[PDB]
Every structure is written in C-alpha cells, then in structure tokens.
Amino acid sequence: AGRQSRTFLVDPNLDLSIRELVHRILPVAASYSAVTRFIEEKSSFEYGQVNHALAAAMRTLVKEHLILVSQLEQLHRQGLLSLQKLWFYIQPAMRTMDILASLATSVDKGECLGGSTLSLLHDRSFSYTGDSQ
Amino acid sequence: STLQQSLELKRKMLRDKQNKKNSGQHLPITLPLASQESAVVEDLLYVLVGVDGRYVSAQPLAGRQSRTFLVDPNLDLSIRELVHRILPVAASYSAVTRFIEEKSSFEYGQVNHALAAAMRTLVKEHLILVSQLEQLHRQGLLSLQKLWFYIQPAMRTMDILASLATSVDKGECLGGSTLSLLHDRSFSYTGDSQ
Amino acid sequence: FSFGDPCGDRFERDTRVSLFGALVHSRTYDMDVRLGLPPVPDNADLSGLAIKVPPSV
Amino acid sequence: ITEAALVRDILYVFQGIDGKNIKMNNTENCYKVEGKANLSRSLRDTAVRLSELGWLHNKIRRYTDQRSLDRSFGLVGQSFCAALHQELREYYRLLSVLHSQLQLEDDQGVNLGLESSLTLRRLLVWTYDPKIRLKTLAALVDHCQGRKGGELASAVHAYTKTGDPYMRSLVQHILSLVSH
C-alpha cells in the first residue's frame, strides 16, 4: 500500500516462536524488495547518469545478495541450513540491506538529483562515520 | 552468600585501590535402591550446580558457611551418610562459585578479581567434571561407591577452596593484605602439592 | 553482510573460536563441529577427581 | 516436558522468544517456566539461568533499538551503538552456533550418556562463561546508560580497568572502536 515497506501474511498456525523469528527476518526481505523496486524504477535512462549509476551499483549488490541466498538455498537443499544459522548469516546482510534501503528512501524523499544527490551522498557518508562497513 | 561478601569486597577494593592506584584507570563499571541412587544422583548433579534435588534439598546458608542440605529422612542411613559426606564438596563449590562470580568484578581490583576468576575457572572445571559424572550416570556408569571415590579428591579440593574462601572473607583481605594472605596460604599448602 | 572472519584481532579470533567466550577448554574454526566435553578420566574412580590446573604455557 | 522442549524454549529465550513451557515474566524481566507440575526444581533453576541470558539479550536489543533511532546521539553515540551492535552480532553468532549444536543433538536423537553429550547441565556449563560475559556487557550498558559524547568516553575509559582478562580485552577492544 503506497510507498510503504512490503508487508507479509504468515500462516497463523505457525509456532509463536517461529512466527516471531519470521517477523524478525521479514524486515530484511521488505528492505530487499523496496531496494529492488527502487533499483528497477530509477534504472530508467530518464534518471540521469548519476541516478542510473546508483541503481547499477544497487543492482550489483542485489546480485551479490542473490548469490548469497542461492548458497543458503543450497545448504537447505543440502539440509545444512538451520533457522538460527540462517538468522545469523543474514543478520549482517539484513543490516546492510536495511542501511541501503534507508539511504534509498532518503534519496527518494529528497528527490535528490545531480549535485543535490551528490551532496546527499556525501552527507550520508558522514552519517556512516560510526559504521565502517 | 559468598557472592554478596565478594561483591562488597569488590566495592571496598575499588575505593581503597582508587586511593592506592595513582594510575588513572578507573575500575570498570519406598524408593528402590537403584531408584534412590538415581534420585540422589539427580540431586547431586543439581547440588553440584547448587540446585536443590527432589530428595535432597539445600538448607539456607547461615553466614559465610558451606551450604547445608535437607535430605529426605527415608533414605538409607548409609546412603544418607555418604550423601552428607559428599554434600560438603557441593556446598564448598556453591560458596566458592558465588564468591568467584562476585569478586571477579573490576571493583575488586585486578588481583582480587583474578583470584575470584581463577576460582571461577576451577569451579567451571569442577562443573565439567560433574557434568561428565552426570553423563556416566545417564550412561549408567556411575555407582555410589565410584561416585564417592571420584568425589573424595574433589571433596578435598572443594574443602581447601572453601577454607581459603572463608579465610579471605573473614580477613576482608584486599590488595597487599590479600597478597600476604595468599603467600601465607601457599605456605599453608606446603603439604598439598595440588 | 557477513560477520567478518576474526582472522585479525587475537581477541576477535578467540571470541570466534570460543563463541564469544562460550567455549571453555576448546577452540574451533569449524562451524559444523559437534561440541563435546572432555571424557571422564579413567582414574576418577580410582584417584578421585583432581582439580585440573591449566598448563602454565 | 521433554528435555528437548526445554532446550527449544531456552533457545527461544536466547532469541527473546517465549518457549512453549517457558514464557517471559515481564514482572521479573525473565522467562518463567509455566507452572506445570512436572518441571524439576533443578530444571526450573536451569531455565532461570538461561532466562538470565535472555534478559541480557532483551536488554541489549532494547538499548540498540532505543539508540538506533536517536539521531541526537551524535557520531560518538552512533559509534557506541555500533560497537554494541557488533558485540550483539558476535553474541548472536555464538547463539547460532549453540543452536546448531542443539540441532545436531536433536538430529542424532540418542541420549548418549557420554561426557560429550549436550545436557541441560552441560549446556548451562558451556553458557556459563558466555553468561558471565553477557552479564558484564549488561552492567556496562547500565553504567553507560544516558551517557553520550565525553560522558560515554569517560564511561569507556573507566571500563578498561576491569580485572577479568576476558572482560579487560573486550573493554579494550570496545574502547579502541569507540575511540576510532
């Protein structure tokens, strides 16, 4: 509904602990979906070279995310993936995707373009002064 | 509990050491015999962790004393006496663990904290041993006589540790007084290589 | 997006192999290790249980 | 109540989730075992010991959520929150490793009375040092509560003098990260 994060319906008959873990992980998937939507929309030639390049970088990171997800899928297919192992492995990935999505949402709210977009990027880079990654 | 005395020792050591430490580092801020044996094993594995068992329950600790236990009167007199002989080790372990966990705080200073930490590490090793004995019981490999034999050295170690803990607690030894007490205890253990 | 490998800092390395200090007497880099404790020594029924002194090295 | 069910509940509590038989008592800010008679008093105490870890986890997560939203914490405050989150990530990795070990124990199905078997007592032993670590971290959070900037730096400098060598190393690493 609108420029909101994607919401999910979970089967109510799931274990409460399982349901809570799902609700804890789902924020990462919502951020991923929002980031992918932003990347796919702002990837139009109409977005100018700066926004296009930003979208391309986001696409590269999404590809890396997909690779990771495929390896986790393999582990599950290998039966080597536990729910806690998945949560642990995605927690840093979840945070990375959430940071990227927050930046995307801030750029979108500011409709930053060209030099204003570059200024916003600089300010965001200062905003991550405490987060080396 | 020894934990409360050790935490108080930590606070005292922090104040005295801050005045002593010109170094500007602030401290951080009807039962079958086999079934009776199984129940006593369960209680001891709980007692080894300081938890009351179903048939053997701990009495409240009066002062800096070893923890006392209430045992079901319907236990075998020989079994009850063996339990009371072994329970001193678990009581010493519980008191030592409380003291170790409290006085390992930075407020007790690195010397008292390290002493408590070493006690905690040895208590951890004791807990590992107790868990292995619990596994043997679950494996059926733990007999009452084997348990008594295996705990006899453990009983002596826990008794020595409890005597040291009680001496430190009675003396409120801190820093150089604690180091003096440690030296005197090391001379006191001239006959005990361990 | 990963918990960075604790190859650099000795404290981080020990934290990883100790699982943030959870491990007492073991260190491991393998995530698939089955955690075991040391077996009960054979002389425990003969000699009692001695307090294991950590080696000075 | 099966021991495996208690293990599951404890793993949920480590994630801050109420188990089937162990639920968080908000009045005690700890997971409480449901009053069903068949829980051993020893088992209850072990559950309480694990819920102390869950209480610390929940406190840490509350702190992280409280400070991640505060832009006013400044760069130093953000760095402190980042250090706390990094330590929380390490803790969650450790918890995941423990969970994977529990899953391995569930998958093997055998109550092997070997000294290597993951018992609730053995689990408590393996998490005792982690429990002490988490207790230290929670005490540090409490002492640094409400401090920012130079007050946070002063709290960090005070924390470097800890007597516990593991705590001392951890606090030194945290001090270096916050000072960066």
TrEMBL record, chain C:
Protein's name according to its UniProt entry: Gamma-tubulin complex component 6
Complex formation: Component of the gamma-tubulin ring complex (gTuRC) consisting of TUBGCP2, TUBGCP3, TUBGCP4, TUBGCP5 and TUBGCP6 and gamma-tubulin TUBG1 or TUBG2. TUBGCP2, TUBGCP3, TUBGCP4, TUBGCP5 and TUBGCP6 assemble in a 5:5:2:1:1 stoichiometry; each is associated with a gamma-tubulin, thereby arranging 14 gamma-tubulins in a helical manner. Gamma-tubulin at the first position is blocked by TUBGCP3 at the last position, allowing 13 protafilaments to grow into a microtubule.
Sequence similarity: Belongs to the TUBGCP family.
Gene name in the database record: TUBGCP6
Residues included from the entire protein: 196 to 252 of 1811
Domain of life assignment: Eukaryota
Source taxonomy: Eukaryota, Metazoa, Chordata, Craniata, Vertebrata
Entry function: Component of the gamma-tubulin ring complex (gTuRC) which mediates microtubule nucleation. The gTuRC regulates the minus-end nucleation of alpha-beta tubulin heterodimers that grow into microtubule protafilaments, a critical step in centrosome duplication and spindle formation.
Cellular localisation: Cytoplasm, Cytoskeleton, Microtubule organizing center, Centrosome
